[PDB]
């Protein structure tokens, strides 16, 4: 999208995510809401607000002419309001079909670029390179375990046999074939691992209160990446370099 599309449409979608397809997470968010936020989602079950898709369809083909290099990016400023002022005047069924056929040729032009190049084989990397983008890329107390953790995570995406690595709205999940607790939230695992990069195992009155703050989410992520690392990895005598040689030898021994 340019984008002309809003994000987080939960005020229109939380009520047919409970009735249709029976989401338990949508129920837990819905009971939490105040009474005013709750009544603005009960009407959208009854009547759904109809949105005009004309300016989103016209702006879809102005971005294609930029993508083909037909016109400069400063020209979709004036040319968009010159094409919307024409379809407001001469609006008819013969025009509304002309927008859809041109829009149908945009998706058919790029779906041919997907099947011929076979980028569906690299569908794991596209979701994953989008995830490692908005990250800070410079952590305090770390930065050699942090760079090496991403490289062993990109290695698991390419070398593991069947990883789906899909995403929900806000975050990115990751599903492997170990049944049960397949899924790992990669986003909330990097907020738990925000402080635990340059931690060294020196200051412990009792063992614990460092390895106990590792939640059950990010502990499973440290279990999936454990066979695909080495000792020529995370810098030695740290906290994360001794987890990854503990979880490696509880998988290489449990065979």
């Amino acid at each position: 999208d340019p984008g002309l599309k809003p994000s987080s449409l939960w005020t229109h979608k939380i009520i047919d995510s409970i009735i249709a397809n029976r989401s338990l997470s949508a129920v837990q968010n819905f009971r939490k809401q105040p009474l005013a936020n709750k009544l603005t989602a009960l009407e959208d079950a009854i009547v759904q607000p109809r949105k005009d898709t004309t300016p989103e369809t016209v702006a879809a083909i102005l971005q294609e002419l930029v993508a083909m290099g037909a016109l400069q990016p400063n020209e979709v400023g004036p040319m968009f309001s010159d094409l919307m002022i024409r379809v407001h005047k001469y609006n008819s069924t013969n025009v509304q079909n002309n927008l859809s056929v041109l829009l149908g040729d945009i998706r058919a032009a790029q779906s041919e670029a997907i099947r011929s190049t076979n980028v569906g084989e690299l569908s794991n990397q596209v979701v994953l390179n989008d995830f490692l983008s908005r990250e800070p890329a410079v952590v305090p107390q770390g930065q050699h375990n942090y760079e090496a953790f991403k490289q062993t995570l990109r290695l698991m995406v390419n070398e593991a046999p069947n990883v789906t690595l899909f995403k929900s709205g806000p975050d990115t999940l990751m599903q492997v074939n170990i049944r049960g607790v397949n899924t790992v939230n990669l986003n909330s695992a990097f907020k738990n691992l925000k402080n635990f990069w340059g931690v060294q195992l020196d200051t412990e009155i009792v063992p614990g209160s460092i390895s106990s703050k590792l939640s059950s989410n990010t502990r499973v992520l440290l279990l999936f990446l454990a066979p695909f690392t080495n000792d020529s990895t995370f810098t030695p005598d740290t906290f994360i370099s001794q987890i990854m040689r503990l979880y490696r030898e509880t998988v290489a021994a449990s065979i």
Binding site: P34, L35, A36, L39
Partner: protein, 51 residues
């Protein structure tokens, strides 16, 4: 030393540049811009008068 007895005292106050605000909430403090008692006027067309 020569002060008069039976001195009645009396008080007052001055408030300038201020409007006496009365919030419409259950407790009289601010939990939100859209108050809690302000949300419970929606149900069954909810018409109220006051004086």
């Amino acid at each position: 030393r020569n002060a008069v007895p039976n001195q009645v005292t009396e008080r007052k106050f001055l408030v300038d540049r201020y409007l006496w605000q009365i919030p419409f909430s259950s407790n009289f403090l601010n939990m939100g811009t859209l108050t809690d008692l302000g949300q419970n006027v929606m149900y069954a067309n909810s018409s109220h008068s006051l004086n």
